[PDB]
RNA sequence: AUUAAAAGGAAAUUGGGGUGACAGAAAAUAACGGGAGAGGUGAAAAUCCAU
């Protein structure tokens, strides 16, 4: 069921606490493989370490070349609702991590939610102390 | 029986001043992809997960 040089799209969506490598069809129905922090490391602390998106992103683009899909249309994105919109530090690391794996890389794009207007925020008035 | 006060009141624009009758985030629901973790913390756990 696999076919030649399919274009990929990879939303990494990498935050504080964990780190997401998906990719999917060009459609964004039909996911490929999808590997996360949590999946390559055993210490709850490490779910997001830059070593463990690499090692996460490595893996999963071997797949994609198995399959065929070869480019990928990254889109980077963090926990942006109400909270930090700045992507995580493991996102940068699955992104090069796929640039080392012999990956074209097409659109680079940053889908992080920005709120037109937003919900309340937790933490109430005086925030986390 | 004085005037016409850089006293006051009365008859071209400025105004997120007051009243009255477009946007996606967050979450939910529906359906599809995938099949093992996900949240969370300085570190963990109670928690959600093969329905």
Redesign the pocket.
Same mark, same amino acid.
Request: glycine content about 10%.
């Given at each position: 069921g696999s076919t030649k040089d399919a274009f990929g799209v990879a939303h990494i969506y990498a935050?504080?606490?964990?780190?997401?490598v998906?990719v999917?069809d060009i459609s964004g129905?039909?996911?490929?493989?999808?590997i996360? $922090? !949590?999946?390559r490391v055993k210490?709850?602390?490490?779910?997001?370490s830059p070593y463990a998106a690499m090692t996460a992103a490595q893996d999963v683009a071997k797949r994609c070349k198995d399959l065929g899909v070869t480019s990928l249309h990254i889109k980077m994105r963090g926990? $942006? !609702?109400?909270?930090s919109k700045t992507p995580g530090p493991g996102a940068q690391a699955a992104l090069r991590a796929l640039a080392r794996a012999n990956m074209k890389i097409g659109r680079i794009e940053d889908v992080t939610?920005?709120?037109?207007?937003?919900?309340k925020r937790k933490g109430g008035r005086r925030g986390?102390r």
């Open positions: 935050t504080f606490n964990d780190t997401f998906h999917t129905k039909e996911t490929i493989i999808r996360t $922090g !949590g999946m210490a709850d602390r490490d779910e997001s926990e $942006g !609702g109400v909270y939610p920005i709120p037109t207007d937003c919900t986390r």
